[PDB]
A paper describes a structure:
[name] is one of these genes, which encodes for a 134 amino-acid putative protein with a molecular weight of 14.3 kDa. While the exact function of [name] is not known, sequence comparison suggests that the protein belongs to the nuclear transport factor 2 (NTF2) superfamily. The protein structure characterization suggests that the [name] structure is similar to LEH and that it shares a similar binding cavity with a conserved group of residues implicated in LEH catalytic activity.
There are two molecules per asymmetric unit and they appear to form a homodimer with the subunits related by a twofold axis in both crystal forms. Structural comparison reveals that the [name] structure in apo-form and in complex with TMA are very similar and could be aligned with an average RMSD value of 0.4 Å for individual subunits (131 Cα atoms). In the apo-form structure, well-ordered cadmium ions were identified. Two cadmium ions are bound to the surface residues H61 and H74, and one to oxygen atoms of the main chain of residue Y114 between the protein subunits. The metal ions have octahedral coordination and other ligands include chloride and acetate ions. Completely buried tyrosine and aspartate residues of this channel create a negative electrostatic potential on the inner surface of this pocket.
Numbering used by the authors:
A (entry chain A): 1 to 131
B (entry chain B): 2 to 131
Write the structure that this text describes.
């Protein structure tokens, strides 16, 4: 029912145009893993850099919260991730599952899962497409 | 502490009995595999998804890394492994499974994992389909 503020902040950081708004949420040794793409970042500079890299490749990145729920230091997010890969025929929107581990307000771990096949198919890109 | 429903779900996926998976679900329960894009509703179809998976993949096994419950919601961090029949090599990948429960029954299961990692580990092309 009630969405944790950290979830709202995470979505706003991904939907905005400010890489540091994402990185600042993370611990100094915090990790970020995108399992769909297979990218791994550690620390705020690299994590803010992942928002920057994503924006460089994808226009109009936006993340909306479907629902979220906390169990102790763990937060689960069901979201929709959308955008338009620059140069691709069409945009995409897919469900995503994000698992956070937190310490107070700080994020120590973020894992993102979503269907890369669905992203590419919606986008009109080949199934084996790479940037 | 891992919920018993999580242990049961892993044992169903790791075993050789399709009905052990389906019996865990409500009559109108849903199962979505986002990596492959498959949707099933009801125990017969859900059991059938275990059968279909086993027909395509040898030694399917699911191990629990950690799991947690928030109300009627359970999150599972697991490792999903097996060997796609005919592929050069086996695979093992992390998976995130989101359950919605009612008592012991599962009303919704969503599975997420990297299909690109599955295929790459397996020695299959990136645009490989059955
Ligand atoms: Cl909730
Ligand atoms: Cl909810
Ligand atoms: Cl994924
Ligand atoms: Cl834990
Ligand atoms: Cl826990
Ligand atoms: Cl997925
Ligand atoms: Cl995927």
């Amino acid at each position: 029912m009630t969405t944790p503020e950290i979830v709202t902040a995470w979505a706003a950081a991904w939907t905005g145009t400010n890489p540091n708004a994402l990185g600042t949420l993370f611990a100094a040794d915090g990790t970020y893993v995108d399992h769909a793409i297979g990218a791994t970042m550690t620390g705020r500079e690299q994590i803010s850099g992942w928002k920057a890299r994503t924006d460089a490749m994808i226009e109009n990145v936006h993340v909306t919260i479907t629902k979220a729920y906390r169990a102790g230091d763990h937060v689960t997010i069901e979201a929709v991730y959308g955008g338009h890969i620059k140069g691709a025929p069409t945009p995409f929107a897919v469900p995503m599952a994000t698992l956070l581990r937190t310490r107070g307000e700080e994020i120590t771990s973020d894992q993102d899962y979503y269907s890369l096949s669905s992203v590419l198919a919606q986008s009109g890109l080949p199934a084996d497409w790479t940037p």
